[PDB]
Design a protein around this ligand. Sequence first.
Ligand SMILES: O=C(CCCCCCC(=O)Nc1ccc(I)cc1)NO
Ligand SMILES: [K+]
Ligand SMILES: [K+]
Ligand SMILES: [Zn+2]
Length: 355
Amino acid sequence: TGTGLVYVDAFTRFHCLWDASHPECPARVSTVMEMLETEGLLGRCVQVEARAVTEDELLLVHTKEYVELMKSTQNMTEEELKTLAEKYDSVYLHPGFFSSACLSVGSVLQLVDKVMTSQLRNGFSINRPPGHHAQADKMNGFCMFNNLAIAARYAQKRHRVQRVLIVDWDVHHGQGIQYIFEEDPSVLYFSVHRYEDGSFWPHLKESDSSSVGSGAGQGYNINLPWNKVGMESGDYITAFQQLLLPVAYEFQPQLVLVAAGFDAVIGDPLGGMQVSPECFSILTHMLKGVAQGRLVLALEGGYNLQSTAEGVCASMRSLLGDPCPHLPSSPCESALKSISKTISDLYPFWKSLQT
Ligand SMILES: O=C(CCCCCCC(=O)Nc1ccc(I)cc1)NO
Ligand SMILES: [K+]
Ligand SMILES: [K+]
Ligand SMILES: [Zn+2]
């Protein structure tokens, strides 16, 4: 039918209590919604209710120990929240975090429901907190629960999906998603990210392309690390055309989930990349060719309010069926070196890569 959109004001109901300038702030999602409206895109979407994730849903990924400690966050004093946050890497807490995080997960599951039952063609959750760093028993990197990792397993259980592709074009490596599915050949994880031999957060050798998955998961984890700043649309277009999409068509997923971060867009104060927002119209378009176009995007990172709004808008135009834009740009030496090396590491597992 149409394109679903989930957003709730509860997504604005948590923020960093000890820094008023923390980049992961409520104005991220309200600026996206403002631009979607002024551009006429919001009204062309099917509005979809959010819902709170269930514990059984959360237990698809997270431990009962971690869920309960999380649920306890809504009744801790500030000091007890600040003290638990410091036990994690790059994470703040707030009395409303757990509630908004449950709705952040559920927003994705609502879209998976409507897309998997052909009620909608695709959808986009304008959610925070983000998720792709959250791990089975740990907060990490502004994330409490791993939205897409839960959605992937949820789709497999509730909708009898065999194979899920997760595409993570946020500028950071989604190491949480990697770890959850590291041994799992039914969930193919692809991440393109700033890396710089480990100097860029999260500073993990596991973010390099030599991490291809383990055991039965070998070949089903694909990292494309950038080792020079300033990458552009041509770097991402090349990556998608000759690496991800060949592997995707060969994998034949039944659902595609996008960790839709926009911190690689030019102007982001964190990602140090130069991607134009319209590039994501082209990347989104390519993904619509797989899995009968059953495609759900969920907001991850992106910290320039205007650049992230424009990146969401370009993605949305493609979800809605608008013509592909003209791009004023046209890969660098560092980017091609990265793509060759990732292809080399994944060569033995994918015929579509073999030339
Ligand atoms: O986008 C993301 C999550 C990004 C996590 C990055 C952690 C390091 C960092 O930049 N921390 C920071 C702390 C305070 C201020 I003020 C500005 C920045 N995942 O995709
Ligand atoms: K990524
Ligand atoms: K995997
Ligand atoms: Zn990010």
